[PDB]
Amino acid sequence: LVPMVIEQTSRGERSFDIYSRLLKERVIFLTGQVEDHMANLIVAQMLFLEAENPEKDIYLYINSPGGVITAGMSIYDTMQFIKPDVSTICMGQAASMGAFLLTAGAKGKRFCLPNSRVMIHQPLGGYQGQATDIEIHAREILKVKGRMNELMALHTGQSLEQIERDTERDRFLSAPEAVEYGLVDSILTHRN
Amino acid sequence: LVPMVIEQTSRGERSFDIYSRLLKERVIFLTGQVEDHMANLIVAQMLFLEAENPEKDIYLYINSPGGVITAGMSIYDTMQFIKPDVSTICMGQAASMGAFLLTAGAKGKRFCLPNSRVMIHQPLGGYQGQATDIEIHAREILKVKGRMNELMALHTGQSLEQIERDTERDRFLSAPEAVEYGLVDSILTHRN
Amino acid sequence: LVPMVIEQTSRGERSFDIYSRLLKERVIFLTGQVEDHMANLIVAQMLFLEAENPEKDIYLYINSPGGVITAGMSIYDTMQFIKPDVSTICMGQAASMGAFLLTAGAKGKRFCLPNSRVMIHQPLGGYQGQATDIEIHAREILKVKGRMNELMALHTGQSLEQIERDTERDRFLSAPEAVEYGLVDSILTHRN
Amino acid sequence: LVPMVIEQTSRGERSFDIYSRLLKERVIFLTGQVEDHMANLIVAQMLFLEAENPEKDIYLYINSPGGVITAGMSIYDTMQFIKPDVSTICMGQAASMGAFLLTAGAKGKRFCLPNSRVMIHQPLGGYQGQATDIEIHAREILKVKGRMNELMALHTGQSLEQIERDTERDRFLSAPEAVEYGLVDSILTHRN
Amino acid sequence: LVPMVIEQTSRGERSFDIYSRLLKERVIFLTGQVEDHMANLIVAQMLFLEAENPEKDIYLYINSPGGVITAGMSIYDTMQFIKPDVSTICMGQAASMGAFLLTAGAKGKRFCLPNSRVMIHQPLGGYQGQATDIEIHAREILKVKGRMNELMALHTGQSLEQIERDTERDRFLSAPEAVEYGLVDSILTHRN
Amino acid sequence: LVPMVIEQTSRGERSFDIYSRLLKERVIFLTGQVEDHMANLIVAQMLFLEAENPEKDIYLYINSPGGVITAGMSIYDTMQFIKPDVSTICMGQAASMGAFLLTAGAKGKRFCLPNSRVMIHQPLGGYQGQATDIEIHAREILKVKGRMNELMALHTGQSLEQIERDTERDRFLSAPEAVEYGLVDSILTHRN
Amino acid sequence: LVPMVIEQTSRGERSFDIYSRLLKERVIFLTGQVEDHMANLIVAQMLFLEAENPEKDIYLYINSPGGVITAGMSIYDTMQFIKPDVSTICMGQAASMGAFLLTAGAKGKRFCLPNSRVMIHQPLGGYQGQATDIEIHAREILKVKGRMNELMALHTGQSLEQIERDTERDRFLSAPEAVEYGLVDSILTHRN
Amino acid sequence: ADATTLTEAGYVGEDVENIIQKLLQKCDYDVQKAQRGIVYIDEIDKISRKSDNPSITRDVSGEGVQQALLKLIEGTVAAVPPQGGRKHPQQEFLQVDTSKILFICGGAFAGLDKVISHRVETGSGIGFGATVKAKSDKASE
Structure with missing residues (x-):
């Protein structure tokens, strides 16, 4: 059950769910x-906030073990399309897609909690059928792997060759290690 | 859980779900x-928006792995019927039916995100029973295959022969490749 | 979920579901x-509209693969009973039961989208038990077959002999072919 | 999703579900x-309507393939117990329990649509256990059979012997056949 | 679905559920x-009605095949404790626990519909475990049998020895048979 | 579904579910x-009710067949913590955990219905794994068993030795027997 | 079913669910x-409460058997980040993660009920695959184990080596034992 | 007169001093004898507040009317215009004292019986331990 919270406004008191109340403050979960x-839901939230105030920065808390690549690209492209700088924060963990997102x-606005655990790996897929169809699907996952590695190098700043070697197998990075790699910019230990 | 948003209006504050709020702006997901x-729901939204303003353009955000052909034709026929031009934007992916839609x-209003993935294939179906019944259903699916190819050639602008060759097996097209093939017109990289 | 819509009236803004909003315009899905x-729900909708305005027509949008005969027959008798004419539009497909409805x-008000597929077949059923019981159920389904063919001939205008031969096995009819057969009257290609 | 209908009166506008709107008109589904x-719900509607007005007639639309005998008797006894005359209209079909209801x-207020199918049969039951218990349960179902036949004969007007022979096995009937048999009084074809 | 109903009051109209509306009239199902x-819900209704008017009687409509004895005893104890006389009514059937309730x-306020079927049997249970545990559980179910028979004899008025003989095996009692046996006071043939 | 109830009092009329209505009267089910x-919910009600009037008593109705021990201690500790005296009433039955609660x-405010049953037994649990781990878990459950017997002896007043012997195996106690044992203080037969 | 309570505010009365009412008092369950x-829901509540009043303390009630390590870290990192002091209370039990949280x-604001239990054990995990990937995942769970033992040593105040010896196998600590160990500060026996 | 027509000062509805104006008509606009007159106020029930109102709306038809009548009933000098006039900075006013003027406010307080029924038979508690000895009785309004 999601709790309901009261917001005091000039017009009067209003009741909001805990997630909607934070959405008003440009926070997407x-x-x-x-x-x-869920990806289309996040996309709708991003576009909605852009219309309200395209100058203010949006926040995207990420606690996920990963998922479909295509769904993630919709969120990634939306984050880059809109004008507001999307400040990503890592709570608990961030797997392949959570890490890619x-x-x-935005550069300088990527954060991670001190005990968060980041993980990056190559795409996972499979197909059953004729040899011809197998070749077709095999080339796509390779292109997706190359396309995802190119983008990771652009954001992290590491060379494409290094990303390939590190992403060949599951690699776990702590919050400080992620800062050196380039996945994040700073750590939020305490409120100053 | 779907979040709720507040919209300021002359009458006063109003509460809408994230999807309904975007529907007010002529956006269908x-x-x-x-x-x-789901197809009948989309059909109801197109008709509702047509009445509100038949001059403004409607938008359709497609992120789907495909599905039933008959359900898709209900959406396709509705789009061509109504006066408003329907702008299609591909988010994440657009499979056989999603790509057809x-x-x-509308020519010139078809868009695709940069990291989107489009795939087009021929129809797939099956029937179990007597040989006489097999001949009936086998002829029907072939007719649908020809009909779908004829419509794709019209929208894409490619020859019918080329479509038959490419759609014989699964073919994956990226956002730039789709522009050349004619599936989409332009790419939405950044807000201008 | 279903998206809510706002309707402007003299009293003020009112909220309606997408389906309920269309029901106000004499549209049944x-x-x-x-x-x-579901059949009793459609029957209730028809009776309700009849009371509001028995002169205005009712529009039934059919996209279904068929089903029970008894349930579908409760909709047919309701349509003929009520005074207002019931216009039928086929979206996507109309199978055996969907085609009968x-x-x-009403004559002259039956419509079909250009890419819709209308399939008609004879009733199918089964029973397990004693031979005496099988004879009872076998005679009943055969009587139903003649009843459906008699009514289909009346609406389509074709002879009973032709309907019996054509419906002996699954027969798929396109929107133009349906016009010649008599299942529908016109094709709604584009709004004029 | 049941649709919502708005009732407009001088006092104001009220929103009801389709089933509840018809309930105000003494229509039970x-x-x-x-x-x-389900039977308990129908019973509550009869008592509620009796309290509102014990003189106005109550309508009951029946479409059901029979069911539990004990649940049916609650509805039957309630109809006879309350002063208002309970009209019965068969939509689609009325099996063993539906036909009994x-x-x-009320005499002269029993109707059926032209294409409705009415089937009557004897009770069905089974028991597993000791021989002594079987005799107890077997005697009970036979008493129920005789009781149901007596009541059906009273309403239909046919002799008890005729009802016993006819109900030994499934006996499908049509709307015209039901009129002569006595199950119904008239057929509703068109509103005139 | 539960159909909602509207009631008219001087303060204004209020929407109520079908069961809640009858609860206002001291009717429990x-x-x-x-x-x-379910038993705790009935207990809460009995106590709620006692507070509203401890003098006005309560009407309990029973239609059940029986169940847990402990749950039923909660309802039985609550009925005796509250000052209002609980007028029980048997709709459809009343098994071992249904009949006990x-x-x-209250003496003189127990009714049964004419076609209802009452049934009374001794408690049934079972335990798997060591012989010592079986002895303990066997003693408890036998005590429950003696306690229930003692109470049934009190309400019915029959001797304890007669109740034991009749309850050894399932005994089906019609509405007239129950009157002479003492389970119910009279039959409710009609409202008048 | 739970039946809604209304309170016709000053300062407007309020509608609540039957359970919430009783909660206002300091009654927890x-x-x-x-x-x-469920235990967490009961804890909130106890803490909530304490704020309104710490002097007024809180009523707890128990019809539970037992459950987890840890969840039960959360309720026991809450009852002893708060200032208002918690009056427990047994409806239907009170097993091992329900009996402990x-x-x-509060002494002198423990009641039991005349036909209610009570049973007390030692804790039951199990663990699968290494012998070293078994010793750890076996020692833990034995400590729990000793702790529970100590508390039961305190409330009932019986010696620890007597409680240990009686709780070795399931012991079923009727309402009068429970009074002598000390589990409850009195019985509620009829309202005075 | 969750009950609803009424709050007597200056601007009339408002209805809140039992959990939302306590959330208003800075209580999280x-x-x-x-x-x-669920972890992302607790994080939202902690952040929301911080905005309302950073100085006031937040109360957290932990009755849980443990769970995912990453999800718990999101809660742990959030507690340390927010300026207000989080006062943890243990009801029923507190397993590995429940004990860690x-x-x-905050030092001096950790409490435990007298009959509560605590359990601390090392992390649990597993992986199936090649030897190379097994070595990878094995290093992280060992690293997570060391990280969790370092943080627990800090709050408890015991040496790191001592925590490792105890956490190697499941350990059960009573409420007074936890005070000596350092997991909690005091026990809440009765309100003073 | 009718209380429903009366409204708080400074609003388009009406003012409470019109009551004296109606009385002045019968007395031939003579304040001396008017001070010894009797007044009747009908439909006073509509002036009551409904319930739990924060007053942010600044209710005029209700609580506002009561606040103005307070001084009038106990007795205070009131400026009454000559005839068919509204209060304004103009000097067209008549000083009338209501100290000796009796007032009889009559209204049909619909729903008051339920309030009385509650207090008399509200009862205490709903459960087994509650006191439901009080029995609701059927009595005329």
């Missing part, structure tokens, strides 16, 4: 396995 | 597997 | 497998 | 297999 | 299998 | 298997 | 298995 349905945030 | 129920948009 | 529960519409 | 829960309606 | 959750009603 | 979620009530 | 979805509370 990315949680759980990434998929088409985390590093996709 | 096509997400997930295409089927009879994507290219079916 | 027949979607999915025909069953007793489609052709059962 | 009997749909699906008969059971204790159909013919149980 | 005992339906289905008896269990802890039926006969528990 | 403990029903079904004890678990963390029943006897835990 | 952590119950059940820890996971990403319990001891994570």
Whole structure:
């Protein structure tokens, strides 16, 4: 059950769900396995906030174990299309897609909690059928792997060759290690 | 959980769900597997917006892996029927039906995101029973295959022969490749 | 979920569901497998509209693969009973039961989209038990077959002999072919 | 999703579901297999309407493939117990339990649509256990059979012997056949 | 679905559920299998009505095949404790626990519909475990049997020895048979 | 569904569910298997009611067959913590955990219905794994068993040795037997 | 079902759910298995409360058997970040993560009920695959184990080596034992 | 007169001093005898507040009318215009004292019986331990 909170406004008191109340403050929650349905919801939230104030910065809390690539690209392209700088924060963990979206945030506005755990790996897929069809699908995942590695190098700043070697197998990076790699910019230990 | 947003109006404050708020701005979301129920919902939104303002243009955000053909034709026929031009934007991906609806948009108003993935294939179906019944259903699906190819050639602008060759097996086209093929017109990289 | 819509009236702004809003305009959606529960809902909608304005026509949008005969027959008798004419429009497809309701519409008001597929077949059923019981159920379904063919001939205008031969096996009819057969009257290609 | 209808009066505008709007007009919908829960709901509607007005007639629309006998008797006894005359209209079909409730309606206020199918059969039951217990349960179902036949004969007007022979096995009937048999009084074809 | 109803008051119209509307008239519905959750709901209604008017009687409509004994005893104890006389009514059927609650009603206010079927049987249960545990549980169910028979004899007025013989095996009692047995006071043939 | 009730009082009329209405009167329903979620809810009601009037008593109705021990201690500790005296009443039954909470009530304010049953037994649990881990878990449950017997002896007043012998195996106690044992203080037969 | 309560505010009366009412008083409930979805809900409540009043303390009630390590870290990092002091309380039980979050509370504001239990154990995990990837995942769970033992040592005040010896296998600590160990500061026996 | 027509000062509805104006008509606009007159006020029930109102709306038809009548009933000098006039900075006013003027406010307080029924038979508690000894009785309004 989601709790309801009261907001005091000039017109009068209004009741908001905990997630809607934070949405009003330009906070979007990315949680759980990434998929088409939740991704379109995040996309709608981003576009809605852009119209309200395209100058103020949006925030995207990321606690997810990853998911579909296509659903994630919709969020990534939306973050880059809109004018507001999307400030990504990592809570708990950020897997392949959560990390790709985390590093996709605006330069200087990417953060991670001290005990968060980031992980980056190559795409996962499979196909059953004729040899001809297998070749077709095999080339796509390779292109997706190359396309995702190119973008990671652009945001993190690491060379494309280094990203390939590190992304060949699951690599776990702590919050300080992620700062050196380039996935994040700073760590939020305490409120100053 | 779908978040709720507040819209300021002359009458006063109004509360809308994130999807309904965007519907007010002539935005329809096509997400997930295409089927009879979701298609009828999209049809109802197109007709509703036509009455409100038949001059303004409607937008359709397609992120789907495809689905039933009959359900898609209900959407396609509705788009061509109504006077408003329907602008199709591909987010994440657009499979066989999603791609057919994507290219079916108004000439010049079809868009695609940079990291989107478009795939077009021929219809797939199956029937179990007597040989006589097999001949009936086998002829019907072939007719649909020809009909779908004829419509894609019209929207894309490619020859019918070329479409048959390319759609014989799954073909994946990126956003720039789709522009050349004719499925989409331009790419929305950044807000201008 | 269903998107809410706002309707402007003399009293003020009012909120309506997408389906309920269209119901106010005498539009009923027949979607999915025909069953007793949904059929009684359609029947209730028809009776309600008859009371509001028995002179104005009613528009039934059919996109379904067919279903139970008893449930579908409760809709047919309701359409003929009420004074207002019931216009039938086929979206996507209209199978055996959906086609019977489609052709059962008011003469001159039956319509079909250009890419819709209309399939008609004979009733199918089964029973398990004693030979005496099988004889009872076999005679009943055969009587139903003649009843449906008799009514289909009346609406389409074709002879009973032709309907019996054509419906002996699954027969798929396109929107133009349906016009010649008599299942529908005109094709709504574009709004004029 | 049941649609919502608006009732407009001088006092104001009220929104009701389609089923509740018809309830104000003394229309009760009997749909699906008969059971204790659905039957209890129908009973509550009869008592509520009796309190509002004990003189106005109550309408009952029946479309059901029979069900539990005990649940049906609650509806039947309630109809006879309350002063208002309960009219019965068969939509689609009326099996063993539905037919018993159909013919149980007030004399001269029992109707059926032209294409409705009415089937009557003897009770069905089973018990597993000791021989002594079987005799107890077997005697009970036979008493129920004789009781149901006596009541059906009273409403239909046929002799008890004729009802026993006819109900030994499934006996499908049509709307015209039901009129002569006595299950119904008239057929509603067109509003005139 | 539960149909809502509207009531007219001087302060204004108020929407109520069908069951809630009848609760205002001191009507409680005992339906289905008896269990802890449903029983607690009936207990809460009995206490609520006692506070509103401890002098006005309460009408309990029973239609159930029986259930847990502990849950039923909660209802039975509550009925005796509250000052209002609980007028039990048997709709459809009343099994072992349903009948125990039926006969528990106030003397002279126990009714049964003419076609209802009452049934009384001894408690049934089982335990798996060591012989010592079996002895303990067997003693408890036998005590429950003696306690229930002692109470049934009190309400019915029959001797304890006669109740034991009749309850050894399932005994089906019609409405007239129950009157002479003492389970119910009279039959409700009509409102007048 | 739970039936809604209204309070016709000054300062406007308020509609609440039957359970919430009783909560306003300082009545908490403990029903079904004890678990963390239901126990947490009861804790909130106890803490909530304390704020309005710490002097007024709180009533707890127990019809539970027992459950987890940890969840039960959360309720026991809350009852002893708060200032208002918690009056426990047994409806239907009170098993091992329900009985522990029943006897835990305030001295002189523990009641039981005449036909209610009570049972007390030692804790049951199990662990699968290494012998070293088994010793850890076996020691833990034995400590819990000793702790529970100590508290039960305190409330009931019996010696620790007597409680240990009686709780070795399931012991079923009737309402009068419970009074002698000390689990409850008196019985509520009829309202005075 | 969750009950609803009324609050007597200056601007009339408002209805709140039992959990939302306590949230208004800076009380958050952590119950059940820890996971990403519930953890993101607690984080939202902590941030919302900080905005309302940073000086006032936030109360957290932990009755849980543990869960995902990453989800718990999101809660732990959030507590340390926010300026207000989070006062943890243990009701029923506090397993590995529940204990880690319990001891994570502000020094001097960690409490435990007298009959509560605590359990601390090392992390649990597993992976299936090649030897190379097994070595990778094995290093992280070992690193997570060391990180969790370092933080627990800080709050408890015990040496790191001592925590490792105890956490190697499941350990059960009573409320007084936890005080000596350092997991909690004091016990809440009765209100003073 | 009618209380419903009366409204708080400074609003388009009406003013409470019109009551004296109506009385002045009968007395031939003679304040001396008017001071010894009797007044009747009908439909005073409509002036009551409904419930739990924060007053942010600044209710005029209700609470505002009561606040103005307070000084009038107990007795205070009131400026009454000559005839068919509204209060304004003009000097067209008549000083009338209501100290000796009796007032009889009559209204049909619909719903007051339920309030009385509550207090008399509100009862205490709903459960087994509650005191439901009080029995609701059927009595005329």
